[PDB]
Amino acid sequence: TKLITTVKEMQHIVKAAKRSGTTIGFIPTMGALHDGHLTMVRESVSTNDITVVSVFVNPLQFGPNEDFDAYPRQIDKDLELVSEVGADIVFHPAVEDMYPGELGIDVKVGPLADVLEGAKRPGHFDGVVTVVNKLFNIVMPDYAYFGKKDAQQLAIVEQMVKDFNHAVEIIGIDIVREADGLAKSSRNVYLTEQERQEAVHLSKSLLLAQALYQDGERQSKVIIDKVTQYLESHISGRIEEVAVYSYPQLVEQHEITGRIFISLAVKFSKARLIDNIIIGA
Amino acid sequence: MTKLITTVKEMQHIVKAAKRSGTTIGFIPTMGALHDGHLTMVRESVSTNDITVVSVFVNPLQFGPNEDFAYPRQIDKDLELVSEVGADIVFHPAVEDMYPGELGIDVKVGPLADVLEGAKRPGHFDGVVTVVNKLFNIVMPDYAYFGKKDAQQLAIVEQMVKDFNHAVEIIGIDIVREADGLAKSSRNVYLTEQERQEAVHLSKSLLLAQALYQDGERQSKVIIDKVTQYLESHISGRIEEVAVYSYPQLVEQHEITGRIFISLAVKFSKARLIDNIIIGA
């Protein structure tokens, strides 16, 4: 399983793939890989002739007082993990190769980034679309795999593909969880023993929101209050968001109709975790 | 005879088949009303590449808000002209297929758009890079051809290719001229008989600028002033700009060093004409 560390060689490999009719699946990551990423890699290896995983800690999607320096890095272990699952290439470019000085053209997300995590993390999704756009032009995949844990990111990337006419098909994969329900995340390693036990209540609060909805609740305020109160009595973390928005349109709902997602953001000591559930037709 | 392709889907299909076959693609984006300047680029592409695609698309995002349907439409004649040169495909998508909704992601040019025509029409070059980025993702050319007549545009498009990691190589084609030196353009017909004779002094003023430079002039101000005075005494039209900037960086300096370009914009009765020359090492 090949570690490719320059844009030029990645391009060369891709061009040769196209010429031979080799289909390409692509899983963009920031490394520190876990079973959530491997689930995407597994699906790609089933569907496509070659599978490329990028590991690139993208500085543009980290803001002030976030965790860019602390972000776990373990490229050898990452390469081993995806090798075991049948991946062909790990694409791991230098920051300077991806960003050789200042960008002359700027890519910015509109209304989809004015709410939720786009409001909580100013410029974050601008950073994501910037790097994903570049990676799609480098790897030229037939399919690109993303996780529904970052539901807002998924909707934004799908819009970008539409807006830019990228030939790539986006596949969103269901949230992969620990046995106790905790959503898999490279940032889970930042959790202390006790926070890890508390963090399971994010997922439990979403099952609570789902039951409330199942039993006929449609007032977002009631769901949000019941979820918030539940989290408050079970976790030491700061509850940054509990929200009910249409999906994938991302417009705040007051009285619930249509397809929605109920989303959470919680700040523990160092770990900032998110989770969601998508409900309705 | 060139095939007129009027949907993104069919254009994508043809490109996908070419990549599998190892067929190389040259691409010339235009807004139609084709003349010898365009055809030189097409000829260049036919010599180099297996297939040659010419787009004809009047892009609304690079016109001002009050502009109607003046820009000439003549797809049959344009198609006949590029067929005669050996082009394979004319790509002519509907504005609604290129721009089906509100864009969810916006592309903005940085400091390359802050001078010259970008300064006069903020958003013009945003509109150019938007359409060009889309067309590159649709056509996936190996080479794309742009005229040096629009030197700022060329620099901006090259920067975008680098920023976005498009695999395309950009080829700048020299300004094609009439025997007397007038840069070729649809607008030339609009010149009155006496104005058409005056309009030759755009090109002559650039030759003056080059002569002054070769004689050792290095203050941008003096070149601007001497070119401006020459022009004003030979034309009845109004000077809109005479400018001196580094190329391709588009930065001004009192004392000329390195490669520069001198650009002109003149408004006659009904025709707005531009010309430029790139000189120095």
Ligand SMILES: Nc1ncnc2c1ncn2[C@@H]1O[C@H](COP(=O)(O)CP(=O)(O)OP(=O)(O)O)[C@@H](O)[C@H]1O
């Ligand atoms: N638990 C999970 N289930 C499914 N997909 C997941 C997932 N966790 C992350 N992903 C997906 O994996 C891709 C790479 O995300 P990365 O940020 O590189 C790792 P992460 O730490 O797991 O996500 P996070 O940093 O947002 O917590 C994204 O498309 C993301 O949605």
Ligand SMILES: Nc1ncnc2c1ncn2[C@@H]1O[C@H](COP(=O)(O)CP(=O)(O)OP(=O)(O)O)[C@@H](O)[C@H]1O
């Ligand atoms: N005289 C010339 N020599 C070389 N290239 C030219 C040229 N005139 C136009 N081009 C090139 O043709 C391409 C498409 O131009 P269009 O977008 O159709 C507007 P235009 O053709 O510049 O109007 P015009 O009729 O005033 O030339 C551009 O890359 C442009 O620079």
